[PDB]
């Protein structure tokens, strides 16, 4: 889109409509006449724009009014309420900009925010830019979170986030113009190679994919329409329904063979019924002719009766002879009808073992997308975030993604090697207890006005707790943690001295022998300037290949590359790296998913802050003190980076509105 129009769409906002969030802060306007709304909506879109064409400099309010035109600049309390709402929610002035008015000499309020994962720094940049004092507690010796960039020598390769899922309304678009990010386009051609090491026939490759999507769509219509959603008392997983669709389809190839082979016995037993009338005329003809010959034996002259016995036997045999040609005429239409029914037989199989094994790979691609076996995804809700896809081709960062958190961490107070342990939140404030990871012996106490927990959903899930909440998190939160899904996928990085793959393909598949191994090393990526290949390990294989040493994996890896490109063309890798995200201390998994029995409405329970009870009985219900960010908190954008960054912007807006007031609301 184009103009103050595309501004609103690039900020994920309906250009012609006021949102639930703006109704909150401008309930006068949304309640008011439709004219005033359009002057708001234009100011909102005009501001959003101004921020977006130049996002390396702050957008002061004074700067906004000046560039804005009449009649829309006639009102300046409105232009202030708009600009102040935007800046507070990260729609303008977020990320790494240059300040115009530098920071207040004296700060206000204290937040301790746990984890410098990307959602983490997202808030700390915003909380700090609102003149708060932010300190940042990170258990690693690095700032990335699940954004992890391997770098040895010239080689660069992401074992965590890799792909910008398209700049069409992506906040990550804003960061790219702000940060030096080399954004490489990803070309969508993916050649599947079966286990042998040779390519799938271009006709098979379209027949399987097209089938796989029709089976997917089936579960959708199975789910949202036929309402097949509980079976035997449990919720249906996409895995189950995907299978139930196939048995209704392996049933149908057989309902159609039975119907066709039963139409052959329909007419094979009309031919039988016909050839019986025809053998029984051949024989009524045999005897008549016999009788008619013996009637010509009487030599003329003959009395008239014995003349009729020749003519009658002649009329009788020409009549019974006429019937038989009708019955070998009818046998004619059947003999070719029967050779054509048998000649166009229905589908002999539903899917072959060669066919299903390629169907597998499309399920591995689903298991990558979702970091879990399809047996665990919720059938109804797994794709519930679909509506918010970004438009545009996907990309990758050729100098590595880490380059982004690292950028987002400049100017910020970050304590590394600091494993939070207990969160203590009370009506009067918060203390957070942290050890040093290196010595586990230095203990730290951090007191603060509120705590922002960007603790990955797997950490939060961990039994026994890696972090103790004091007081315990309310049941409605902990149940939302149990119900949710934190899943697994891993990455094998392969690092060679020379480019032996096809340089002009970014990514290609490998097709799995079993269903069980459908996850195992099922997809490869060539992305970086250096000879680098990169293998996904999703599915059930994800969690399994963690119990198997690096070499066995890089073995199975080179095994695949050999079959596919020829033993001789596959050198040894100079450097190799397997990820173990399910075993990583401060991850416990890869990213979240909508587990069966979960909804996206758990993603929203996840983000409701915690208000501690009254300290003194009968004291006024306090301020909320414990806030949650992270990719597992943002319903409309789960399990991405941009979704995490977005959540940190959210809370930082929420934390400021609670502790610095919201002056834009009268």
């Amino acid at each position: 889109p184009s103009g103050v129009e595309g501004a609103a769409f690039q900020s994920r906002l309906p250009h012609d409509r006021m949102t639930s969030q703006e109704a909150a802060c401008f309930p006068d306007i949304i309640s008011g006449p439709q004219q005033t709304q359009k002057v708001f909506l234009f100011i909102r879109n005009r501001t959003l724009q101004l921020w977006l064409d130049n996002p390396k400099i702050q957008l002061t309010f004074e700067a906004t009014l000046q560039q804005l035109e009449a009649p829309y600049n006639s009102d300046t309390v409105l232009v202030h309420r708009v600009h102040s709402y935007l800046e507070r929610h990260g729609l303008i002035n977020f990320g790494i900009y240059k300040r115009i008015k530098p920071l207040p000499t004296k700060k206000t309020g204290k937040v301790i925010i746990i984890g410098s994962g990307v959602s983490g720094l997202a808030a700390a940049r915003q909380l700090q830019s609102f003149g708060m004092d932010v300190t940042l507690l990170e258990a690693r010796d690095r700032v990335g979170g699940r954004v992890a960039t391997f770098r040895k020598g010239n080689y660069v390769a992401d074992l965590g986030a890799m792909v910008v899922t398209g700049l069409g309304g992506n906040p990550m678009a804003v960061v790219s113009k702000q940060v030096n990010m080399e954004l490489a386009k990803i070309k969508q051609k993916c050649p599947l190679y079966e286990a042998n090491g040779q390519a799938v026939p271009k006709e098979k490759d379209e027949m399987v994919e097209q089938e796989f999507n029709r089976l997917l769509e089936a579960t959708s219509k199975l789910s949202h329409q036929l309402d097949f959603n509980v079976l035997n008392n449990k919720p249906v997983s996409l895995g189950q329904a995907l299978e139930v669709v196939i048995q209704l389809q392996e049933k149908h190839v057989k309902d159609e063979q039975i119907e066709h082979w039963k139409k052959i016995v329909k007419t094979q037993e009309e031919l039988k019924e016909l050839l019986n009338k025809m053998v029984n005329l051949k024989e009524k003809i045999k005897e008549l002719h016999q009788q008619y010959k013996e009637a010509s034996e009487v030599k003329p002259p003959r009395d008239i009766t014995a003349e009729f016995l020749v003519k009658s036997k002649h009329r009788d045999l020409t009549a019974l002879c006429k019937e038989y040609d009708e019955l070998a005429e009818t046998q004619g239409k059947l003999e070719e009808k029967l050779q054509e029914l048998e000649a166009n037989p229905p589908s002999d199989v539903y899917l072959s073992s060669r066919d299903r094994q390629i169907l597998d790979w499309h399920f591995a691609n689903l298991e990558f997308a979702n970091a879990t076996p399809l047996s665990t995804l919720s059938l109804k809700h797994w794709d519930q975030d679909d509506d918010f896809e970004f438009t545009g081709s996907h990309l990758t960062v050729r100098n590595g993604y880490s380059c982004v958190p690292v950028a987002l961490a400049e100017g910020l107070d970050i304590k590394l090697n600091t494993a939070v342990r207990q969160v203590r939140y009370t009506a009067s404030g918060c203390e957070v207890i942290a050890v040093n990871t290196r010595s586990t012996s230095q203990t730290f106490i951090y007191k603060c006005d509120a705590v922002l927990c960007t603790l990955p959903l797997g950490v939060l899930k961990q039994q026994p707790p890696a972090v103790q909440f004091v007081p315990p998190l309310p049941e409605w939160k902990t149940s939302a943690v149990q119900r949710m899904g934190f899943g697994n996928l891993n990455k094998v990085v392969l690092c060679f001295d020379r480019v032996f793959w096809d340089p002009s393909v970014n990514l290609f598949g490998h097709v799995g022998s079993t269903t069980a191994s459908r996850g195992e090393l099922f997809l490869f990526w060539n992305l970086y300037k250096a000879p680098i290949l990169l293998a996904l390990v999703a599915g059930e294989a994800a969690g399994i290949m963690e119990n198997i040493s690096d070499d066995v994996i890089v073995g199975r890896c080179l095994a695949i590359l050999k079959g596919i490109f020829g033993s001789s063309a596959v050198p040894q890798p100079k450097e190799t790296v397997v990820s173990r995200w399910r075993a990583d201390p401060w991850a416990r998994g890869s990213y979240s998913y909508v587990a069966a029995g979960s909804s996206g409405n758990d993603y929203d329970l996840m983000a409701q802050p915690i208000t501690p009870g009254p300290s003194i009985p009968g004291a006024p219900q306090p301020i909320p003190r414990l806030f949650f960010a992270g990719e597992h908190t943002i319903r409309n954008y789960p399990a991405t980076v941009h979704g995490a960054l977005l959540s940190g912007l959210r809370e930082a807006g929420r934390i400021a509105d609670q502790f610095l007031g919201a002056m834009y609301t009268l």
Partner: peptide, 15 residues
């Protein structure tokens, strides 16, 4: 979730 696919983007269910 589905938005994560970059290759062979599934399509059965997108509406």
């Amino acid at each position: 979730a589905r938005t994560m696919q970059t290759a062979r983007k599934s399509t059965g269910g997108k509406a």
